[PDB]
Amino acid sequence: VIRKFTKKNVARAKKKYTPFSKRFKSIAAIPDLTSLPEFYGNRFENKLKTTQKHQIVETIFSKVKKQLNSSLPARENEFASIYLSAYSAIESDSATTIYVAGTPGVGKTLTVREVVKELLSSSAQREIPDFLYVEINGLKMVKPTDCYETLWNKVSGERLTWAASMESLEFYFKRVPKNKKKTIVVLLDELDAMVTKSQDIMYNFFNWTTYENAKLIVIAVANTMDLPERQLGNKITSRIGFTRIMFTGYTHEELKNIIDLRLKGLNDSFFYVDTKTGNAILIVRKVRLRMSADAIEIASRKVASVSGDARRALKVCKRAAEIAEKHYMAKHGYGYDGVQTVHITHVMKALNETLNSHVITFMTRLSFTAKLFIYALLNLMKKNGSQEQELGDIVDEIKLLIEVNGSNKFVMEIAKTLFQQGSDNISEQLRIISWDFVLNQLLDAGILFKQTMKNDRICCVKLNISVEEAKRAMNEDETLRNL
Amino acid sequence: DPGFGSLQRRLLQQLYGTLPTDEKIIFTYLQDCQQEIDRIIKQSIIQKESHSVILVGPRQSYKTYLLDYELSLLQQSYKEQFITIRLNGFIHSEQTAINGIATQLEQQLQKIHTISSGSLTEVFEKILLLLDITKITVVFIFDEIDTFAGPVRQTLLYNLFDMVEHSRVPVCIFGCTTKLNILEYLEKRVKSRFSQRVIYMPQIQNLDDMVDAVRNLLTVRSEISPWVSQWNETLEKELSDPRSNLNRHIRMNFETFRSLPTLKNSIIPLVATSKNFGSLCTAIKSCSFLDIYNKNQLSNNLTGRLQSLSDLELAILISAARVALRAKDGSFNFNLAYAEYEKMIKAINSRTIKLWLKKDVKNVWENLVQLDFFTEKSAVGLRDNATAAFYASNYQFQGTMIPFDLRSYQMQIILQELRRIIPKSNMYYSWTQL
Amino acid sequence: KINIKFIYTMLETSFLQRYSTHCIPTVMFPRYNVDEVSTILVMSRCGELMEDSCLRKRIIEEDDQFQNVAANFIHLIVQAFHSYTGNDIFALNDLIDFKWP
Numbered sequence A: 001v002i003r004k005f006t007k008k009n010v011a012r013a014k015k016k017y018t019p020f021s022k023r024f025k026s027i028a029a030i031p032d033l034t035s036l037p038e039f040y041g042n043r044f045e046n047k048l049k050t051t052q053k054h055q056i057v058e059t060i061f062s063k064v065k066k067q068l069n070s071s072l073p074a075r076e077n078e079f080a081s082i083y084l085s086a087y088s089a090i091e092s093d094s095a096t097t098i099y100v101a102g103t104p105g106v107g108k109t110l111t112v113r114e115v116v117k118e119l120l121s122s123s124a125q126r127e128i129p130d131f132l133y134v135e136i137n138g139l140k141m142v143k144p145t146d147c148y149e150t151l152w153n154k155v156s157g158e159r160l161t162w163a164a165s166m167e168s169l170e171f172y173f174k175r176v177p178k179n180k181k182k183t184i185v186v187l188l189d190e191l192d193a194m195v196t197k198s199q200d201i202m203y204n205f206f207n208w209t210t211y212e213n214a215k216l217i218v219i220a221v222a223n224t225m226d227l228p229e230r231q232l233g234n235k236i237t238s239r240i241g242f243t244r245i246m247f248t249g250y251t252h253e254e255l256k257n258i259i260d261l262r263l264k265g266l267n268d269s270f271f272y273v274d275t276k277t278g279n280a281i282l283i284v285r286k287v288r289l290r291m292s293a294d295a296i297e298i299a300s301r302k303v304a305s306v307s308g309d310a311r312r313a314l315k316v317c318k319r320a321a322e323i324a325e326k327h328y329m330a331k332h333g334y335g336y337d338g339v340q341t342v343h344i345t346h347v348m349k350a351l352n353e354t355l356n357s358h359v360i361t362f363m364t365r366l367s368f369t370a371k372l373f374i375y376a377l378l379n380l381m382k383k384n385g386s387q388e389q390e391l392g393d394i395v396d397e398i399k400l401l402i403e404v405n406g407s408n409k410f411v412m413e414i415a416k417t418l419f420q421q422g423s424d425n426i427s428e429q430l431r432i433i434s435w436d437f438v439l440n441q442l443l444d445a446g447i448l449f450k451q452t453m454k455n456d457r458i459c460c461v462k463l464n465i466s467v468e469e470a471k472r473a474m475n476e477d478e479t480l481r482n483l
Numbered sequence B: 001d002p003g004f005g006s007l008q009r010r011l012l013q014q015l016y017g018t019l020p021t022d023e024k025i026i027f028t029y030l031q032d033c034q035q036e037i038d039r040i041i042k043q044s045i046i047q048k049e050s051h052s053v054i055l056v057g058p059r060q061s062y063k064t065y066l067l068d069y070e071l072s073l074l075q076q077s078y079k080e081q082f083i084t085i086r087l088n089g090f091i092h093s094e095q096t097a098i099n100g101i102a103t104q105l106e107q108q109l110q111k112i113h114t115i116s117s118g119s120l121t122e123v124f125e126k127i128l129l130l131l132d133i134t135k136i137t138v139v140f141i142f143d144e145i146d147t148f149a150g151p152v153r154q155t156l157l158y159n160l161f162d163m164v165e166h167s168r169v170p171v172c173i174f175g176c177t178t179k180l181n182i183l184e185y186l187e188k189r190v191k192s193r194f195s196q197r198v199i200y201m202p203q204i205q206n207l208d209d210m211v212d213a214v215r216n217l218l219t220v221r222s223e224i225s226p227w228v229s230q231w232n233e234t235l236e237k238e239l240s241d242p243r244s245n246l247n248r249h250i251r252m253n254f255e256t257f258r259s260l261p262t263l264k265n266s267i268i269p270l271v272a273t274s275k276n277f278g279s280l281c282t283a284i285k286s287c288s289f290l291d292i293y294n295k296n297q298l299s300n301n302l303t304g305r306l307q308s309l310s311d312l313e314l315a316i317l318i319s320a321a322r323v324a325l326r327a328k329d330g331s332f333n334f335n336l337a338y339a340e341y342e343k344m345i346k347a348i349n350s351r352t353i354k355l356w357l358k359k360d361v362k363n364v365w366e367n368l369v370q371l372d373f374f375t376e377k378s379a380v381g382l383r384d385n386a387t388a389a390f391y392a393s394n395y396q397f398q399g400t401m402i403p404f405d406l407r408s409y410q411m412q413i414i415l416q417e418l419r420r421i422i423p424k425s426n427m428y429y430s431w432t433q434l
Numbered sequence C: 001k002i003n004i005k006f007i008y009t010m011l012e013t014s015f016l017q018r019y020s021t022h023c024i025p026t027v028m029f030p031r032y033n034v035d036e037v038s039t040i041l042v043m044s045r046c047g048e049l050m051e052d053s054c055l056r057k058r059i060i061e062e063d064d065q066f067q068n069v070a071a072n073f074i075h076l077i078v079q080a081f082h083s084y085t086g087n088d089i090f091a092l093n094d095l096i097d098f099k100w101p
């Protein structure tokens, strides 16, 4: 047959369509699912392995940088609340929802994972019954319904399509008796990412916690405390509940304790450093490593002022150690193959490059034509105050600025280059040389905005950057500030 | 002469940058940047540290050049330590980036010694399984990374920066963008997982940086030809004289374009069209081919297109321009322009030009529209993306359903510009005034 | 071993000027003037005109001389209609085809 179009790259999974409600004849026909070899969890790692032919030189700051990587001193009350709710709901065989919200990097996922680890340790001591832990991250899903595919695959071991998985989970949570079940603890991380238009997924996940036979713990980690009030309906907000756990950004003393806990064994300690290569061994010269308490304190105070984000504090300390290690390796010439201190200067330089703006020094290093464009644009904003200027007006005002300051030395040397490219055989041009080039360059830089128009004269252009930093970059130039 | 052929071929190889890796030319103003990049690669491929960094610089500012040079340097000595995944934001979408990563992972892993099989859900699950005696470093080069830092949802950036942060597989991610404020594009969690390592690519700051870059581009440092020493002497005599034609063209590029690829695109046919060594030395002393090149690059603009017009075309364009200048919104049609045209022909003939009929001026009008002298009024033109273009292709615009003599147009060149570039000896010059 | 190389042809200047910061090598083709247009028309059309069937039936109804006849016709067509066509090879070719028999 002759097709009207073709779909030649269809990749379909081997997922069955029949839900769990048709797996046995009756409710009484359902066996004990705990004594089943595929329920409740009853190969790629070696492809990224090779043989090492050299000996990596780990310098003395490499252990500091390794210990400062992201891979519970400040979360006691949050840990205790989450653990007590989960322990009470597991040991009494009930279903509940715990809500956790906070800004990035305040220890939400780490605290919930530690709670789950301690509950698994308590279930290994036969103090609470066994449970299955499932982690669903909404930003790791391709489609939002794939969470239905994930959770059911973690429960039964089957692979169904998402609608059949949703019916299977509904039948499982509602109809299967508690004597044939295991408790499930589900972490719904990045809860805002699973919010869709119809909000059926959110309703189903929080409504399964209201069923009497469910034995389901849903720990929902969010980014805002008012997500059910802003984005969800009244039905899902009623099911989530009034009790919500806020993870506040860290104060500077807790960030100080976090950084000291990552460096408890390294700070104020001695290393055997081999001066031939640079390789350092933690307990040939005996060198003491030190990072200043003033440096850690000022980085922690800065980070707690900004966000209270532990990732940022660890990254600022790691960047300071990297800067100091770069200077040390440069001054000794070591390569990769008596007191070494990472100081408050390195911490301030790590804190400054994140706060430095390149926009002004980008604009001060442009050519004369791009600066002339920006200067004429600012002149037109001063003349009429419209904040959007047509490109033809910019052309006319560039021409005006050339013919008005014609007695200037630099302008009377630049005019032949601008309008004829220094050639007698080239006619006088309506645009300057490199007009399109500097227009497109300022558009790709994000300095400029241009409307989608086909007439080149009446097309409007807007500053995307702030006006005063453009004026500062214009007054930096010698020629433009004199005319 | 085979010696001049070898010298010419080597000069073209140096201009296109296709030298072997140990002979590769790094400009001095690019050095401290590239050593910085040389640190990060060497901390990832060799010392197995995880890094995330965005290169920020304009187009043709040597981001891909320096990254490719670093990968070529590491491939010569450490070729079993790392694999390379290349993504481009124009070519890969949010769906096809996953298939691109998985396909590149399998063709790189079989090159060192399936992941991409199945539906996109299974492919992404297998990528997260693989990525979330030593380890092989995965090096991501993500060109046009601003396109994946969209306002909607930055899923791939989230997962990739989580691979940098929490995974035990050593991952190096290099993003490239022209956006100066790339950090404001990132979502809060994506920015929290990003290291805020942003390397701003260096700019040319003064003239001797460009002269030194030209000297590095054109000096031949190997004994490939009998002509090498004489060519080096000629080139150094040209670049050391501040009044030479080469320094004048380099200065003009510095004040207009400030771009070494722009200069290279002109220098390449200067070398290639030379037939012997004496012609090449004469061409580099005079640089007259650079003037011919500059004239050709401006030949199809508004100024050059005007000089190709016939007298009737120029008359219709002048009449349309003065009608548009008299209009409040700059709009005009075929009828008003024809009325102005016949008023000028009888005003000229009263003081003998054939007065062309309205049925013959239609061809002139269509030629003027096709040559981008008039644009349809309030026309958007070329759309930014394929979705808006597809939306526009299913709608019938009101300009295309009315007769052609009532369509509203606007000028691409105004009457003042027409007075500026039409010669005084032209007999329609007096009507460019009002 | 195989390296693809792209050669593009573009018509309009504004489409090309959208992509100027990419620094792609460009060769421009300016429009011909009227003398180049006339020379191209003569060298492309006089051979087909001087072995046309209408001329060969007309000379038996009533080679260099036929070449001068066709070339003078082309020059007269150019001087009559260059203002109408501009420097358009296709339009002048169509006018020559319409007016030759």
Ligand SMILES: Nc1ncnc2c1ncn2[C@@H]1O[C@H](COP(=O)(O)OP(=O)(O)OP(=O)(O)O)[C@@H](O)[C@H]1O
Binding pocket: A069, A070, A071, A072, A073, A074, A075, A102, A103, A104, A105, A106, A107, A108, A109, A110, A111, A258, A310, A311, B189, B192
């Ligand atoms: N109390 C803490 N003690 C030690 N390290 C901590 C602590 N809190 C956070 N960190 C560090 O910061 C990292 C970020 O924490 P986590 O992943 O829990 O953040 P989050 O609140 O879930 O953030 P996001 O919303 O971006 O996912 C942890 O992996 C750990 O390295």
Ligand SMILES: Nc1ncnc2c1ncn2[C@@H]1O[C@H](COP(=O)(O)OP(=O)(O)OP(=O)(O)O)[C@@H](O)[C@H]1O
Binding pocket: B016, B017, B018, B057, B058, B059, B060, B061, B062, B063, B064, B065, B066, B068, B143, B177, B178, B261, C022
């Ligand atoms: N692998 C390479 N080998 C040789 N020359 C190269 C290579 N990559 C780029 N170049 C050249 O280096 C110069 C600088 O352009 P480059 O592609 O490096 O810019 P870029 O900063 O990556 O630009 P864009 O932002 O458009 O991607 C150009 O002349 C280009 O031809």
Ligand SMILES: [Mg+2]
Binding pocket: A108, A109, A189
């Ligand atoms: Mg988290």
Ligand SMILES: [Mg+2]
Binding pocket: B063, B064, B065, B143, B176
């Ligand atoms: Mg590039």
